[PDB]
Amino acid sequence: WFPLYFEAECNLNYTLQYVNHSCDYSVRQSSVSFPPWRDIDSVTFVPRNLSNCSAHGLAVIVAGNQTWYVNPFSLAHLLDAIYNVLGIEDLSANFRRQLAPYRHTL
Amino acid sequence: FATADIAEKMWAENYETTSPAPVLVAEGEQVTIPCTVMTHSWPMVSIRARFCRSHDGSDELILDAVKGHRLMNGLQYRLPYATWNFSQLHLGQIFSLTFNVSTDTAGMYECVLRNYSHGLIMQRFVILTQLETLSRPDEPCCTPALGRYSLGDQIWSPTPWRLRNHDCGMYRGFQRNYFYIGRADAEDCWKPACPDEEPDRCWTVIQRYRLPGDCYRSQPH
Amino acid sequence: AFHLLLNTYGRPIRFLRENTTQCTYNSSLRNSTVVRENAISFNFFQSYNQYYVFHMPRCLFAGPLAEQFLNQVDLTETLERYQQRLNTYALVSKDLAHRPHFNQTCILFDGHDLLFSTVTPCLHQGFYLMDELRYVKITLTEDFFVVTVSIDDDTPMLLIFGHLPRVLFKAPYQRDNFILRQTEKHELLVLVKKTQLNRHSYLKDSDFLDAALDFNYLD
Numbered sequence A: 001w002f003p004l005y006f007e008a009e010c011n012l013n014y015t016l017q018y019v020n021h022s023c024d025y026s027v028r029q030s031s032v033s034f035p036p037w038r039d040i041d042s043v044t045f046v047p048r049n050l051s052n053c054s055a056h057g058l059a060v061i062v063a064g065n066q067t068w069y070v071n072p073f074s075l076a077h078l079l080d081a082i083y084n085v086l087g088i089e090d091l092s093a094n095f096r097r098q099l100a101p102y103r104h105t106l
Numbered sequence B: 001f002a003t004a005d006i007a008e009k010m011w012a013e014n015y016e017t018t019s020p021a022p023v024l025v026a027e028g029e030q031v032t033i034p035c036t037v038m039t040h041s042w043p044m045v046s047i048r049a050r051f052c053r054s055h056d057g058s059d060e061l062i063l064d065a066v067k068g069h070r071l072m073n074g075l076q077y078r079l080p081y082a083t084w085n086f087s088q089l090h091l092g093q094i095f096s097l098t099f100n101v102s103t104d105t106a107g108m109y110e111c112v113l114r115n116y117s118h119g120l121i122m123q124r125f126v127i128l129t130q131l132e133t134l135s136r137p138d139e140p141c142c143t144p145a146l147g148r149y150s151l152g153d154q155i156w157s158p159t160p161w162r163l164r165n166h167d168c169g170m171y172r173g174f175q176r177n178y179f180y181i182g183r184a185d186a187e188d189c190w191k192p193a194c195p196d197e198e199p200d201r202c203w204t205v206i207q208r209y210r211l212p213g214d215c216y217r218s219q220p221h
Numbered sequence C: 001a002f003h004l005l006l007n008t009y010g011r012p013i014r015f016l017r018e019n020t021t022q023c024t025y026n027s028s029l030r031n032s033t034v035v036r037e038n039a040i041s042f043n044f045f046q047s048y049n050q051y052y053v054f055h056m057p058r059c060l061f062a063g064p065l066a067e068q069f070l071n072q073v074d075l076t077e078t079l080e081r082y083q084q085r086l087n088t089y090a091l092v093s094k095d096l097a098h099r100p101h102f103n104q105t106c107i108l109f110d111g112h113d114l115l116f117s118t119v120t121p122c123l124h125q126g127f128y129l130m131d132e133l134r135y136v137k138i139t140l141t142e143d144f145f146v147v148t149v150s151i152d153d154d155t156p157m158l159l160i161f162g163h164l165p166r167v168l169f170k171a172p173y174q175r176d177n178f179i180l181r182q183t184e185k186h187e188l189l190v191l192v193k194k195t196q197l198n199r200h201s202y203l204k205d206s207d208f209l210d211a212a213l214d215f216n217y218l219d
């Protein structure tokens, strides 16, 4: 038994097209000053699905109305192991299926 | 990358002649490492650290030799909040690193001239918080005579009058007594956490330096 | 009602099991309610106009595990340069193609360019003897040894064997890198710099360090 959590939402007005050829983790200085999980508002991801200009994937974060883009594969490979060591990887039993394609192919 | 790990080492002739004797400093103090270098041809200068609590290899802070622009920082994982410094002095540049000393931050620090492949060690600083000493059982407690830097191969502390000591059990029959600088709390209240390992990466260098007053310490060959 | 849950703290909510399942209402009842103390979310589309959003026990996810993790990534590093970095490892195999630790603890693999760090109770010593100025030391877990060795102010030579940790690995690329004859029950891990070929001889052939007594007992 564990804590219970979220869902999947439909009918959104916000969309992806805004990037206008913004296709990469263009910000790095923020990386050497990451906000911890304590200070994050939300985190996002896309396997560059809609992008001619991106292929495999990218992710974004917002913290105190502060935002920047970073690639998705390390967290995909990582959070699984983090749960496994914490012993709550079973909670991913369902959403691990959705998250499966988003680890690096090798 | 700006550079790989230093591939071939070199040492200055004054390296051991200019490296000060290891120093003892109380935990939590904001120590700062000085450094001075005359005008050279090396594109890069950098500060090099070796922690001796459960650390291996080396990590580097790389700086632009003239401008002072940071180019790479390997110290981040141990020293997330350390602040560096640079000061072009028409005669010769000055750079430094600052941090709050603690058990996990004690180690050896060296100034290193650098280019993409080559590098030359200038000077070495050894920072410590606790020191090993062995007391024979029935014999009274030893009493070292630490002081300020003075000069020579002598271990020293900037605040010798704040010295305090404690014991951590037995070793081959000897009673292990540890020396440290206190006053971080009122009177004798503060007691440092028990060291977990010895001999450490600091060992070979430190046991080559004497300690004032009568006391016993296992020493290299 | 609202209280502390940390680490593997499923015990309280096992009976205080408040719930949330479905698509609509922007998760207001659970997420916006627990905003009273904390609400942190991940979102991922499943199609145009359809999206999956995760809400988490952010404070519990913000436990000591994340504390240790914080400095362990640069999630802004790129695949091809990851691949280039991989080449720094020798990879000899595929290139050829009452308890004492109750009062002592270790922190391992710090600043490691290709692996993640961790703390553990341990015993950490050397051998009965040492020809000093070439230094070694060892550390132990209950079912796998770990060692390090070098005298040169650079990355040393690392060896590990036993029932090795099942997920401890910094990169996503192929973890299996070792002996054809690997044991039926246990695993080996050795990591060294690429240039070690010039000096390290024992890697080039079968075995090392035993008096013709290699196998662990079983019968």
Ligand SMILES: *[C@@H]1O[C@H](CO)[C@@H](O[C@@H]2O[C@H](CO)[C@@H](O[C@@H]3O[C@H](CO)[C@@H](O)[C@H](O)[C@@H]3O)[C@H](O)[C@H]2NC(C)=O)[C@H](O)[C@H]1NC(C)=O
Residues within 6 Å of the ligand: B115, B116, B117, B118
């Ligand atoms: C980083 O800086 C070092 C500084 O020594 C560079 O190595 C040096 O390269 C020069 C190239 O001319 C060598 O000088 C030449 O060496 C030989 C032997 O003396 C001789 O044929 C010439 O008269 C001339 O002096 C110099 O010896 C060499 N230094 C050492 C210690 O080997 C190095 O190349 C620089 N790295 C990069 C990537 O530029």
Ligand SMILES: *[C@@H]1O[C@H](CO)[C@@H](O[C@@H]2O[C@H](CO)[C@@H](O)[C@H](O)[C@H]2NC(C)=O)[C@H](O)[C@H]1NC(C)=O
Residues within 6 Å of the ligand: C098, C102, C103
């Ligand atoms: C770990 O070592 C410590 C050393 O302090 C032991 O704790 C006590 O140490 C004092 C002396 O400082 C002794 O008088 C006590 O008998 C020790 N035990 C207790 C319970 O206070 C501690 O016992 C050791 N633990 C283990 C598991 O070996």
Ligand SMILES: *[C@@H]1O[C@H](CO)[C@@H](O)[C@H](O)[C@H]1NC(C)=O
Residues within 6 Å of the ligand: A011, A012, A013, C049
């Ligand atoms: C957009 O907003 C309008 C106005 O509220 C709404 O009718 C519509 O369903 C929303 N969704 C999309 C995908 O445009």
Ligand SMILES: *[C@@H]1O[C@H](CO)[C@@H](O)[C@H](O)[C@H]1NC(C)=O
Residues within 6 Å of the ligand: A017, A018, A019, A020
């Ligand atoms: C570019 O971004 C704007 C918002 O700044 C967005 O409305 C638009 O869709 C994007 N470009 C295209 C071609 O849609």
Ligand SMILES: *[C@@H]1O[C@H](CO)[C@@H](O)[C@H](O)[C@H]1NC(C)=O
Residues within 6 Å of the ligand: A047, A048, A049, A050, A055, A056
């Ligand atoms: C995008 O997803 C669709 C299926 O929904 C698939 O046909 C397409 O190949 C995907 N593209 C990428 C880059 O994943």
Ligand SMILES: *[C@@H]1O[C@H](CO)[C@@H](O)[C@H](O)[C@H]1NC(C)=O
Residues within 6 Å of the ligand: A050, A051, A052, A053
């Ligand atoms: C690239 O754009 C063309 C033209 O719209 C389209 O046919 C093709 O599927 C696009 N490819 C990707 C990967 O988005």
Ligand SMILES: *[C@@H]1O[C@H](CO)[C@@H](O)[C@H](O)[C@H]1NC(C)=O
Residues within 6 Å of the ligand: A063, A064, A065, A066
């Ligand atoms: C959010 O925006 C406000 C207003 O500009 C600003 O003061 C604040 O620093 C921003 N927050 C972050 C985390 O950057």
Ligand SMILES: *[C@@H]1O[C@H](CO)[C@@H](O)[C@H](O)[C@H]1NC(C)=O
Residues within 6 Å of the ligand: B028, B029, B030, B081, B099, B100
């Ligand atoms: C370091 O110590 C100083 C006082 O010496 C203190 O103000 C500061 O908060 C401490 N922490 C850091 C990260 O410097």
Ligand SMILES: *[C@@H]1O[C@H](CO)[C@@H](O)[C@H](O)[C@H]1NC(C)=O
Residues within 6 Å of the ligand: B083, B084, B085, B086
């Ligand atoms: C360098 O140190 C001085 C004090 O000696 C301080 O005022 C200054 O801010 C420091 N510079 C940097 C870049 O940290």
Ligand SMILES: *[C@@H]1O[C@H](CO)[C@@H](O)[C@H](O)[C@H]1NC(C)=O
Residues within 6 Å of the ligand: C015, C016, C017, C018, C019, C020
């Ligand atoms: C499940 O959630 C509902 C509200 O969504 C709540 O009334 C109920 O008590 C919860 N179940 C338990 C066992 O707490």
Ligand SMILES: *[C@@H]1O[C@H](CO)[C@@H](O)[C@H](O)[C@H]1NC(C)=O
Residues within 6 Å of the ligand: C026, C027, C028, C031, C032, C035, C039
């Ligand atoms: C959706 O939920 C978030 C998180 O609780 C909240 O901040 C936001 O105001 C909500 N938005 C709407 C449109 O209900």
